[PDB]
């Protein structure tokens, strides 16, 4: 969970 839904 260290990213996000968009690039």
């Amino acid at each position, epitope marked *: *969970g*260290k*990213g*996000g*839904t*968009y690039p």
Partner: antibody
Amino acid sequence: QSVEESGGRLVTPGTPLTLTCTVSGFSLNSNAISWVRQAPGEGLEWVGAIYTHGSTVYANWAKGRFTISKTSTTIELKMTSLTTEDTATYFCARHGYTYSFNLWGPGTLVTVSS
Amino acid sequence: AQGLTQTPSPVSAALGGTVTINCQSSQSVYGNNRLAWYQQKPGQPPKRLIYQASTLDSGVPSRFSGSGSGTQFTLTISGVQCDDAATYYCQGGYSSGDAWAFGGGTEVVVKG
């Protein structure tokens, strides 16, 4: 879709303070947030991040003076042991899945001064 | 823990000339390509130009190109414009040490 920092103000050295990042149009349940600071005339310095499940990571240099927490709509940065050297703009930034930042606030200014 | 370094400032070119900005990481970035470039002008937030070393972000002029991998990255600007006078920062993602880290930035001066 936006983030916006608030809470920047003039404080004396040793005065604790809390900055707030307010998010719009995306979930903190699926998007990580970093705090990034910038001293006047200086470079971007990653402070730390709060991941989707509430876990936190900090830059080596933070040395426990920075605490990040979140609610559903906001991320707080709590800072302690401020000296004049902590005078800086603080940004919050949304994480992209590319492990880069895809959304920035205008910044808020912490002034540590007599 | 890990250390990022860039081309010293200032990098100068004539309007319409070519600019090279390098970024070196003491540690390989995540998957050898988790390196992003940001542009920043005084008083403004940074704007992402490049992510994953070589992908232009939405609406970024094609005169900007990222390349490299592992520990060595390059941002070039061809036909440099007055609009490109700015500080440029590289940013790595890492599986070990500081998870995110910015280079110190490189200032571009455009000789108009």
